[model samples]
Target chain A: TETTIVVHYHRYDGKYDGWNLWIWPVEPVSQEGKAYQFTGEDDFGKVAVVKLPMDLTKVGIIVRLNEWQAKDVAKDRFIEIKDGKAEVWILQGVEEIFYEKP
Target chain B: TETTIVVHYHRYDGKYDGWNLWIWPVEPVSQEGKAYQFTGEDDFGKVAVVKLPMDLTKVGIIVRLNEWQAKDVAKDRFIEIKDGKAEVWILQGVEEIFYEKP
Candidate 1:
């Protein structure tokens, strides 16, 4: 069994007027059937959950979360193409649970 | 019988650096209007849900959805005061099934 870590991070302007939302995956794409989807958005905010083969070092490894507008992407849809761009960092990097500034 | 629809949206930076958060009501106040707020953040991110009447056009209606950081707003206060500004959209519309492109 692989150890998994659930990392929660938010992106928003420091001001109090606008907000840009985003989610990321923490692990690399190793196998198939690893899917993630937007369950729902509540008062707290929107949420997306992914179930992949466990890997501690790669646990909280985000394969790919969605943006505020990219609510249509799903686990089975393991790809997000928006405004002529692709968000595929959810499955980048390894050796760390929480991301550090370089 | 009336019908209802839910619309989800999000905003974010292209590269990766920061995020701005916000939430606005989807309907207007009728009893001094009403109240809406945020609750928490999850792996999927954040969420905000309003318990509106069973009115078809209002079933999926949003009182106010929290921005990435404004994840602390809540129900109880008929109003919200944030950052030298305020957001009261989730509680400003009433007759539309969804939202118009105005």
Candidate 2:
């Protein structure tokens, strides 16, 4: 099955480095084939990109913001998923994106 | 770990075929055991099934509607996973049984 994932990202300050992204399958990948990968970058003041993964498909994606990055960015920094895509935002603090899947 | 997925499926129409069932784990079942299977089926017009898988679990399930169904079934279906066990409805529609682990 082929599905598309659109991400809305928000980059703060001018920092957009070492940001880790992982797609956590709400279901087993063996069952639905994983679909996740850094497709492209969209810098819309607050950046939002369109990512399409081939494997691990259909599982919900979790975007992590590291401590340093979180500290730099505002607490409001977060991502929201809708219409089979994700929208990431950076409030107004530090400027970093962390990575974690748990 | 042993876990169960109680599905609150709202099957409309008299026709029922292959429902696109998919389960994805927020955390891979490799770490968490898959808990989804057609444990049993009930004849409640709006059927609810208690599934228990041992491999792939966590990911959401997608119930696909096939032919042999009608438009007589009214749907006000909703599934809530509070503590666990999913309580389904039928008032509802055809209680269709399906499975999937994305």
Candidate 3:
């Protein structure tokens, strides 16, 4: 089975706010190897990325500012290297906001 | 029916990211009145609030930074006075991120 890393960013107001970045490796690799570093810049020139120690199904990052940040980062610009192959996001705006009835 | 203002914050990665702030007025007011100012501080001390020209059913804000900002803002601390009743949010973390098949 192929493993993928989903990057989730949570906004300060409690809404994931519609940001989801995905990472896919060319070949199945053990999670025990060196961590992979992901980095990119937002529209406001503020840049950030994460280092994954292992391949995980899901991960979440928190964004706390609502007015000073960019609405979206260029997913195609996200860079990652693993298994001797480099990969980037294939799609952007793949996430949505919904409510459930309790 | 009463009109409410829903504040939606979009993260840089295209995820609303789970942040939603609600604003309700004690009495219905016209959108023509002076804009109501909202001011509050996040965990990182970065403060922002929107001035609504009128009641809105939905509004969206953009949060660009995921690492430097606070994960959440205190809802109880949001203060607004309209129609003389003063209202605040009754819930937090009310939004969610999802994917559409199409």
Candidate 4:
């Protein structure tokens, strides 16, 4: 979409509460902010929605700890967004990401 | 090999009609019951998913019709099915089978 695109992040057993979302190659409006917070909840519980300034087919996504110290993850998990409607669901204690509601 | 494996075939502008899915070796205990049907669709449209009998790291794949009378122009393409997912996208009128989604 030429307008803002929305992204959703699953709450997953409340394990991701107080967690944050980070993206790269910023929006140029990139300086919009850091440490983005999930603004809503639904059938998937907690959700992180971001309206990107432009259409991005791909982006880096990291559901990080509140503080920047040691994510200890396998680096940034690169995400390929289809059309718009981007979302991710993580299993409790597992690192694989799911694009569906899961 | 005693588990099921899955594969996803892109709709590719819906040019795959009359085309059927075919795999090889039967591998005895599995092969998703042979010439399996594409039972699902995703962001890219129609998906041909099959849970083979075993853990197949790689296998021969052919999207054909008439059992051999006509095909997607591409010869039998060998696909790499790691973990448990296999997605293949093709360019119409060409013989290249890209293992990534369109």
Model 4 misplaced regions, further than 4 Å: A1-102, B1-6, B10-16, B25-33
Q: What is the TM-score of chain B alone in each candidate?
A: 0.25, 0.39, 0.24, 0.66
| Cα lDDT of model 1 by residue, A2-102, tens digit | 33222222333222122222232323422212334445443323334433334322221223322221122222122322222222222122322223322
List model 3 lDDT by residue over B1-102, tens digit each: 223432323233433332333332222321111122224433322223544545443333222223212234322123344332222222223333221111
For model 3, what is the error of residue A72's alpha carbon versus the real structure, in angstroms, after optimal superposition? 2.4
Kindly give the stretch of ten consecutive residues in candidate 2 chain B with the minimal lDDT sum. B67-76
Where in model 3 is the C-alpha error above 4 Å? A1-50, A60-68, A73-102, B1-87, B92-102
lDDT of each: 0.27, 0.36, 0.30, 0.55
Q: Determine the backbone clash count of candidate 2.
A: 63
After superposing candidate 1 on the true structure, give the runs of residues whose Cα lies further than 4 Å from its correct spot.
A13-29, A37-102, B1-102
lDDT of 4 by residue, A39-100 (tens): 87776556666666576665555666554422425344545666744666654445677766
Best by TM-score: 4
Look at candidate 4 and tell me the lDDT of residue A22. Answer: 62
DockQ category of candidate 3: incorrect
lDDT of 4 by residue, B1-102 (tens): 433445555544676666666675322212221466667767665566666656666666666553443456544456666575666765555567676665
Higher-ranked by TM-score: 3 or 4: 4
Q: Model 2, B1-102: lDDT tens per residue?
A: 334455544444544444323333332331221223333455633343544444332333334332111122322122334344444333323444333311
